[PDB]
């Protein structure tokens, strides 16, 4: 019933993501020199290094705030490359499933703890 | 005053186009397996290999017929990729300028010759 426990849980989940091969395209900002039309499609770029930095700086007040930035990584991936036959679409689907499976217990534990406070 | 002169002029202009790096995406038909939404946007596909073949077979009666097929290559390019920041948009603009500058004297020489006949 610890309202601070999510911070270190999310730190370890991001460490696991950076170790997964499927995360490689999402570890740093999309390269706008390589893809100069990216900003015509995408409003707000996002990547796992930015999420990890935002957490480390204590600029997330809750794990749901962190989830909003992660959702944007997968929203942007689909918007720029929607082809279901592409390598990046299949990498996005597997890493999204991996994130959702591990974050679910972090969110429900946090919600339980918050009721008590 | 030669009404046949345009045939060899257009053959040499196509040779110059095929040697320009900007022509690479337009040298053969768009791959409809790689771009399966292409025919949802594009009514009549066209490429420089088809134009060269049509000329060689003597199926153009005038240089204006050849010119309108080449203009369709640039109409299709802009319709499928309109982003002004894309590499293909800037390649299209430069190659189109090059073609128009060389075809103008082929058309005016032919029109002069035709008046005489």
């Amino acid at each position: 019933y610890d309202i601070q426990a999510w911070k270190k849980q999310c730190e370890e989940l991001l460490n696991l993501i950076f170790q997964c091969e499927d995360s490689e395209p999402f570890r740093q900002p999309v390269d706008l020199l390589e893809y100069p039309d990216y900003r015509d499609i995408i409003d707000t770029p996002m990547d796992f290094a930015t999420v990890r930095e935002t957490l480390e700086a204590g600029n997330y007040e809750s794990p749901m705030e962190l989830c909003k930035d992660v959702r944007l990584i997968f929203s942007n991936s689909k918007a720029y490359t929607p082809s279901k036959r592409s390598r990046i679409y299949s990498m996005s689907l597997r890493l999204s499933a991996f994130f959702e499976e591990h974050i679910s217990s972090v969110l429900s534990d946090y919600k339980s703890a918050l009721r008590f406070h | 005053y030669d009404i046949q002169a345009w045939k060899k002029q257009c053959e040499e202009l196509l040779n110059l186009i095929f040697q320009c790096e900007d022509s690479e995406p337009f040298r053969q038909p768009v791959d409809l397996l790689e771009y399966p939404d292409y025919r949802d946007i594009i009514d009549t596909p066209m490429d420089f290999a088809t134009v060269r073949e049509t000329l060689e077979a003597g199926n153009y009666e005038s240089p204006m017929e050849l010119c309108k097929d080449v203009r369709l290559i640039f109409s299709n390019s802009k319709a499928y990729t309109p982003s002004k920041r894309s590499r293909i948009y800037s390649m299209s603009l430069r190659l189109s300028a090059f073609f128009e500058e060389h075809i103008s004297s082929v058309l005016s020489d032919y029109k002069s010759a035709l008046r005489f006949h």
Binding site: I41, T81, S83, I88 | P25, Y80, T81, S86, I88
Partner: peptide, 8 residues
């Protein structure tokens, strides 16, 4: 992708 844009 989005025309001759996107990643593959």
């Amino acid at each position: 992708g989005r025309g001759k844009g996107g990643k593959l």
